[PDB]
């Protein structure tokens, strides 16, 4: 069976705590659709560094992702390890550098550039496993569509989405990484500082760049999926003030991710450009979210790329099949 729960755990509507996974106690919020017509498509939205899981689900400014349950989607939003099972915790310990082999603390989304992260060149990490186990467990109490499991997120959550799609494409039918990092590296897997990294990518904008967000080396093949990468435009940057300052620019990262997924023949990639900067899509939010999910739901796992049809997104967005062509000149 595709569906199972860990010993002693049973899923319920709303907040779930103490889900056992890789020896940790994990939490997640379940918002079921009113009817699971024999099998509901799934949306797993993830916050980034400073927004609380409940904001992403219930506050417009942060996405209002629970609204998708009104349109037939089962929505499951996972709580970050650092928030220690609190869905109302925004930043806290989450706003910090990573440890134990990880780059950034919110999500186990990319191996650290030093030796500490070498095990993660091949090990997907605890978060990739949690996300799958979580969905597999909810699936024992509500009927879910195994071929329509989609995940997504903003910032660190988009980074985590990229990692899960790279390491566990057998599970997810695809997803929507919004302004996620790629942690681009040189071909041999080594990392150079932010500035050089930005420049090397701008110097070769169509190249397939390796990255610590994924396995090293990146897979030459993946299971069938549909991926919608979202870039928020010129101001889509992450700057946390001195001394670190500007440390992520999502132009090269969404270019690099779009290049890779567009190069995998059995994966449909959609490159969406918006103008809201770095936060959940702000223009026509509800409409965009529903457009994006229905677009992914139109391409269930195992669909042929040649049959995918892209419809126009709401005003505020410009999407094309394939890699981004609007990031570099």
Swiss-Prot record:
It catalyses: nonane-4,6-dione + H2O = pentan-2-one + butanoate + H(+). One of its GO terms (cellular component) is periplasmic space. Optimum pH is 8.0. Its EC number is 3.7.1.7. GO terms for molecular function: beta-diketone hydrolase activity. Keywords: Hydrolase, Periplasm, Signal. It is found in: Periplasm. Optimum temperature is 37 degrees Celsius. The keyword Transcription regulation does not apply. The active site is at residues 155, 258. Monomer. Catalyzes the hydrolysis of 4,6-nonanedione, a beta-diketone compound. Also mediates hydrolysis of oxidized polyvinyl alcohol (PVA) in the second step in the degradation of polyvinyl alcohol. Not active toward the monoketone structure. Belongs to the peptidase S9A family. This is Oxidized polyvinyl alcohol hydrolase. It comes from Sphingopyxis sp. (strain 113P3). The gene is oph.
């Amino acid at each position: 069976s595709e569906w199972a729960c860990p010993e002693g755990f049973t899923p319920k509507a709303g907040l779930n705590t103490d889900f056992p996974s890789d020896g940790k106690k994990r939490a997640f919020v379940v918002v079921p659709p009113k009817d699971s017509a024999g099998g509901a498509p799934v949306w797993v939205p993830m916050v980034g560094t400073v927004e609380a899981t409940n904001w992403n689900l219930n506050v417009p400014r942060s996405g209002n992702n629970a609204k998708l349950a009104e349109h037939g989607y089962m929505v499951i939003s996972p709580v970050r390890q650092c928030a220690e099972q609190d869905p109302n915790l925004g930043a806290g310990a989450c706003n910090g550098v990573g440890k134990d082999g990880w780059t950034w603390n919110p999500w186990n989304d990319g191996r650290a550039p030093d030796a500490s992260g070498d095990k993660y060149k091949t090990d997907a990490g605890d978060d990739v496993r949690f996300l799958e186990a979580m969905v597999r467990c909810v699936g024992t109490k509500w009927k879910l569509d195994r071929k329509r499991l989609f995940l997504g997120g903003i910032s660190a959550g988009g980074t985590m989405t990229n990692r899960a799609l790279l390491f566990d494409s057998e599970f997810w039918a695809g997803g929507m990484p919004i302004s996620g990092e790629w942690y681009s590296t040189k071909d041999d897997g080594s990392t150079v500082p932010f500035q050089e990294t930005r420049k090397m990518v701008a110097a070769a904008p169509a190249k397939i760049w390796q990255g610590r967000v994924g396995p090293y080396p990146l897979p030459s093949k993946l299971d069938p999926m549909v991926v919608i990468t979202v870039w928020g435009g010129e101001k889509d940057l992450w700057d946390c003030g001195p001394p670190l300052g500007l440390c992520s620019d999502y132009r090269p990262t969404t270019q690099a991710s779009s290049n890779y997924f567009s190069s995998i023949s059995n994966v449909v990639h959609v490159a969406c450009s918006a103008t809201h900067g770095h936060m959940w899509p702000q223009v026509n939010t509800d409409a965009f979210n529903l457009w994006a999910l229905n677009t992914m739901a139109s391409h269930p796992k195992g669909s042929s790329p040649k049959d995918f049809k892209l419809t126009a997104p709401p005003e505020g967005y410009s999407c094309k099949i394939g890699r981004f062509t609007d990031h570099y000149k």
